[model samples]
Target chain A: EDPPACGSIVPRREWRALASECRERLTRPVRYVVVSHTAGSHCDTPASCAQQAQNVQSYHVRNLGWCDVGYNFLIGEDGLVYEGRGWNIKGAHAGPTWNPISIGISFMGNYMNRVPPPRALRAAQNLLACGVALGALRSNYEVKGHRDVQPTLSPGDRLYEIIQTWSHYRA
Target chain B: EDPPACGSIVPRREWRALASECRERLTRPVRYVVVSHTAGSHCDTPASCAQQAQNVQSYHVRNLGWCDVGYNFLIGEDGLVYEGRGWNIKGAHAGPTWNPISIGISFMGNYMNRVPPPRALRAAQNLLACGVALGALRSNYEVKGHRDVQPTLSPGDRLYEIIQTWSHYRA
Candidate 1:
């Protein structure tokens, strides 16, 4: 039937997320998809990248005193999608205004100068399409760069350029 | 202009390189390229893949007590190349004999049952061509699965089958 939950993401069980609480559900079909980056570490193998996903949750939960990870989902360079708070919950990725109305999908590495590999980019585009297919994201959902919503250089300069070329990107 | 070095490799520096002391070297115009797989967890984005690269080095250097990562280079399902020991140093992959004469490149995760994404496959093929162009590998170099030399199913079944169809694979 339908591919499990949340499109093709590695389940929370797969990554072994800690027992933690997250925010209230965001009303679906989310109208926006805000892209960001880890600016921390990237991964290509399942073992290594799974650890990174766990680490992200730890930072948000233990270090930042927030609920779970800050994003709705995380994209890995190995070309797999990772479940964050998932599609139903609100994320802390872009502060207050955008969190309630959008899906926050962050790339796993810094891309200020270097671009993400082709598979990583493709996974993200595919994720959005899946979101639409699942009716979690609106048919007319718009994509925005992390830089667009806040005072940061997130999603990296090179990655920002590539997303701008996406069909859904908005100014 | 000459195609950018080794297709789109994430340089050792870009992925947060540790100070390496790997001193062994491989001869230029080398005759073979050996392919293997980690048989571990995998990732799919720039951020996650970069972290995976770090974990591989950490294991090789800290746990395995090797000089650096064991492979000459690594490919991710994200369709990007990661610098391991680079083109010059002898790798610890394959066996002792093959390590010195051939460049060892491993995919980050298991491919026993699943095939790596098309982009990942393309990246590996492109890297081989680039190696020849840089005089790091022989223009007439051959590709061999890790199992061919070592008594292991490294590059995996699904992957091994695909490589045989390549123009350069040799028994």
Candidate 2:
């Protein structure tokens, strides 16, 4: 039996996500990757992380009136990646300038004062690799902290510093 | 001894505007003007309009973490134009692509079902004329409804229809 190409990523159905109404499509082999953080609660177990994902989606959908969660993928401390808008859909993460051209991935908790555990970081890195393997992202795609493109404190201080050390990270 | 350059416009000081921390400047003689609406409560008197201006700025500053009210100017049913970020400073209205290249002027109320009073519409038109006179906007500056440039229901249906008939209005 063959394993899924993207490893143990959680699908929307598994997490009980609301149906998304997003219609805009992102062009494939996108050149940019934006890393951000939920700046909300964190979860360390599968059950808790699933619920957290639901909460995140609810806020974006119900409150902000967005079609779905803003990111392409969401990382949890449980060492799993939750599918968001995914690779082909344009996300509402960054502003119009970057949203159409980049893939947005957010960690599930605030990272200003605390860094995500190693497992969570690894899950994000693996998600990026999987994107490249799926031909959804260019092999030489650039990674940017959310703060780099927007006037926001997203991805936070500690997490921002770690992404800067990644090989694909650009100023 | 002389009347103010912009006819009967309410200065920021009169409106009790908070000090704006915005630093970016727009290039002079900009070619575009974007019109929008607050989608909030309407004000029909000088006292109420001033209070409404303060409320608008407070939400943009305190809640949204923006430097000031997003529009460069606001219009009120009292027939007064209220200063916002004004001509030089770039506003946070619209998206990154338009903010730096256009002046944003918003009517201070929801206009989806109702239209702004004649005085309110006149106040906005006068402000645009003043921009051209001051060489802040191009001689042939194009006006756009907020919905035309962003994913929003702004400028509202009734207001949007009226603007479409203006000489400077563009698709």
Candidate 3:
């Protein structure tokens, strides 16, 4: 028997991620998904986006002294989903309350002044469907912008606005 | 008997603060002080600072729907403290864990690239002393930069650096 296959998510090895030391796990079939943005540089090519993914993970692990990158998955402007902590592990994003119950997915660029390209948005939507199919997220799971639960301007303005229009967004 | 006088704190009335609708209270002689920055505009004169205070309170009340300005006090380059939730009320500055156990004070401008003036820094130190004298904070209260407890780059780079040198700062 094998687990359900997910979308075309780029594996950690593909992105050259550092071996993570995190051990905490989220309960299966989680009920929430938190969307955020890196608020950093954007990349339009697979190579550049892969490098950005490694850069984000290095800062989290080295600079912030986290066990791994804060997000469960990262979406690139190049229309790819980069694996982070994946489905079973707890993430450090969205503070203590949401971290245990939600999978955090961040766009790999600032979305305050601009919107992510259509392919990027579609990739994220497909990723959510994959989560449900894999029994990682509940079918009725709700989606929330990072700012909806925290004080920071995460997921940025333009991105935050778009997430509100998502079918699962509650507030 | 009169409450112990604080340093030159500008009352909410003077700054034209809207009536706050919050009722949550913090236990007296709280044990923590969290420092942050508005990450907005700075002011160098009494008049400009007063307006900035009102602007902050309005955003919290109108935009964010918080009961009042998030901080217990706001510092200005004008070398004054603007009253926010004050001593008795719990603030919305830090997250759920720290807000109730701490007095949150924010400087009234971005401090990533620049440091607040010496007078502004002195004003904040004086406010802490006054909080102790007024029995609003424990004499042994710990001071923490905003980034120390949250994922955000608040209190900014230069300001976070200076706070680390405060006598009561811990990790």
Candidate 4:
């Protein structure tokens, strides 16, 4: 998908994601979606969430030497889906193999013991539907937690369990 | 009088300020700087600070029916100044007399019981210096608590006490 065709996402402009430095792209019909979490601050308002989005991108760009934010998209507790690199580009979220083939979406908060609000979950699921519709994701895309493929305790234990119950979840 | 000549500030663009609908203007060489607070959530990181700035704007624009965020500028606990009306425009912060002449700058969170970090104070001070350098504010500008002019407990008691120690505090 050249541009997202569906889903209510906060455009990079809205959330103020930095100018793209991404130089890589992933093949279409991505078969996997890796879910992760910032394991950092949680925000409940669009203003705060947008700021959080900027911080994430700054970290990935300035500190980590990445081109842009690490995730293809970011879900916020404020109940918004933020476009990171969006659908076609490769992200520095998961390890090498998965980064090349899967879409990475991280929830912007520490969710080890806390549950994301209903609106946040709804936004993430809606983003997934949009991905499928745009053909950026396979019709039967597999959703996996960051911990499921990588050794890190990411996406948090609480979010890990929640994604498992999602219809698209797979081991 | 243009965009901040010195100190760092998150411009209205970064904060996603709504379109301009205000016409009030503060004369240059402003003599007073009124400090206030949101009595809302505080943020200490770049991301969270941006959100707090946005939230204040949303409240003023959407709820208060103001042309834009009420303050001329907003201070974030993250040690950054988020621009509101900047140095030239007037803000709907204080009542009639003060609003037309003073530069209203608000701290993002309630400081009634809590004190902002020293870095936040430093940022505010640096911002004032920038205003003085740019001739937006008089070199002998007086710093006043929101409660000084307005009939309410604002800028928070703790913050009020802190500002009272500054050399410019009078009455």
Candidate 5:
């Protein structure tokens, strides 16, 4: 049998719609969140990066047979935010350990080679606001890197340092 | 380069020492608590559940590659608490993703196999009072189950069913 619902985990593209409609559609609050690097690196060419992200999504949703990208949203290199894994569905990310409790998002470009594209950074802020508005997140809940769970150099070194720039945005 | 001192991730026993000497320990007040299994499960076959708990400790401490068992303490199937990991160190038992800021504990045997144990229950209440005195936890912070983070059917169905019984230990 399926697990009982913890709450909804929405992707970035549709995040706007969900956040806007939370009052009418949601029964419970959205809680923990996770961030991913969809293509694993920001390519020197922007177009290539976008295509790579599409490939990542296709692998997860279609190839992997998941509902969508398995993540709630995607943060693009140009800073545009896109939706993934549709809202109100249980996410297949975070393994069994955390998938039941968190909403996951992926940043389309690899910030390891560079700081998050300004668009992504702003998108992070917008998403966080959505988290707050929806009530699944507490104002002080931490917004940490995936490495914070198990040891992985994910989210990369340079981008990790740059993230401190938005300390105000973290829980 | 090394990770930050605070990021080293010591086991809960080490955390006790760290907390004891913490010049910056909070004074705001509250506590993290343990609960119990029904009956005096300490009388389980072969040996009491408390003994099984002790055995679990040795394995968890050394096998876990940490200084001590992951939990701050354990309530016996007999309902008596056997202090395990100390407070200052971070607990390894709770997934870092869900509980990076708190310590964790478990009660005797597979009490989830049965009802609540009074000895374990009383022991849990006592530990919670001490945790409150330390001022590290907040009442609103709450007590959680091993199942809360991961998919394991731990702490058990019977134990998890009555978590409210344990929550009353709050000051």
Candidate 6:
């Protein structure tokens, strides 16, 4: 599944740019990512799979109520990054203050029955490395499922399980 | 009656194109504004008018959930200035990492009724100072409303009277 570039990311004020600390923490080259996945459960009844992701994206982009898409890159059941915010720009989907500093990558689908696509995960790795090169990231970083960070049956029990497997560093 | 440019305020990254003093005083020449109206009533109303400014300019998909109007510089009824996020650089307008470093301006609105006219108070004063020079404490920058600072009617009532008195300031 290919994501559409609905809009772009930009600095709010040209006078001041990104906070140095924000960039430092974000661009720290996340090589180790602990992601959760739906290793077993096969979700038979998922909502408007793609539509849910797209609807939310359109809501934030077209509405301007909450502050952007609230997520960095969103992955759908199709195992594609639907592009919530984008690459180097800032994302508010994570934490309030930290959201501006960190990247917000989210999966669109529930991921309980159907886990995030391996392609999406791999894409995230490549994107993180690329972010390092592009100056958006530092060296390498870590990837943990949303459930691990926050607290919700999010990402899903099945999908979160897969996150435990990617702990080893290849490079 | 006349309004400034409904066009662009200048890229968010460039809000500080003013003077060091202005930036120092306003905290930073502003990037992200809250833009509340004198009556909006959601966050700051009943007591004063409610400060209900909005994000200006762009659809800001990433920074501002993509609202149709981006209001980094908010307007008011008498068209005074209410401060927001502070003009540092980052802005709370856009999604995550872009809220700080931005200048947030707000105004008074009905909240339940309208979002304050484009020519509303603080919205105009603060934004007008953008683009070119740093506003002065004397000149036109002398405008100040919001008795709401103390629980007065502020935006619509007294502030409107104050703005009506300043009609002579039109260039």
Return the clash pairs for model 4, or none.
Answer: A47-B51, A48-B51, A51-B47
User: How does candidate 4 score on lDDT?
Assistant: 0.82
- lDDT score, residue A158, model 6? 66
Ranking by lDDT: 3, 2, 4, 1, 5, 6
Q: DockQ, in order, for the candidates?
A: 0.08, 0.01, 0.01, 0.02, 0.01, 0.01
Model 2, span A1-171: residue lDDT tens: 562243346789867899889999999889999999999999865567879999999999999999999898998876567889999999988999999999999999999998886556756776777688678999999999999999999999999998998889998
Least accurate stretch of 10 residues (summed lDDT) in model 2 chain A?
A: A1-10
For each candidate in the order shown, give its overall lDDT on alpha carbons.
Answer: 0.82, 0.85, 0.85, 0.82, 0.49, 0.38
Return the top candidate by DockQ. Answer: 1
lDDT of 6: 0.38
State the displacement of the C-alpha of residue B98, model 4, in Å, after optimal TM-score superposition: 50
In model 3, how large is the Cα lDDT of residue B14? 67
Which regions of candidate 4 deviate over 4 angstroms? A1-4, B1-171
Report the C-alpha lDDT of model 4 over B1-171, residue by residue, as the tens digit: 123134446667766668768886878899999999988889876568777888888987889888988888888776567788888888888999799889998898989999987656766886787677679989889998989998978999899999999877765
Question: Interface RMSD for every prediction, one decimal?
Answer: 9.6, 27.7, 25.0, 14.6, 23.7, 19.0
Residues A129-168, candidate 4, lDDT per residue (tens digit)?
7678678899989999999999998999988988898888
Worst 10 residues of 4 chain A by lDDT: A1-10
**Model 1 bad stretches (over 4 Å):** A1-6, B1-171
- Candidate 3: regions farther than 4 A off: B1-171
| Candidate 6 runs further than 4 Å off | A1-52, A61-64, A168-171, B1-171
**TM-score for all models, in order of appearance:** 0.52, 0.49, 0.50, 0.50, 0.38, 0.34
Q: Chain B vs. true chain B: TM-score for each candidate? A: 0.95, 0.97, 0.96, 0.95, 0.63, 0.31
Tell me how candidate 1 scores on lDDT: 0.82
Give the per-residue lDDT digits (tens) of candidate 1, residues B36-61: 99786676756767789898899889
Shift in Å, residue B145, candidate 2: 0.3
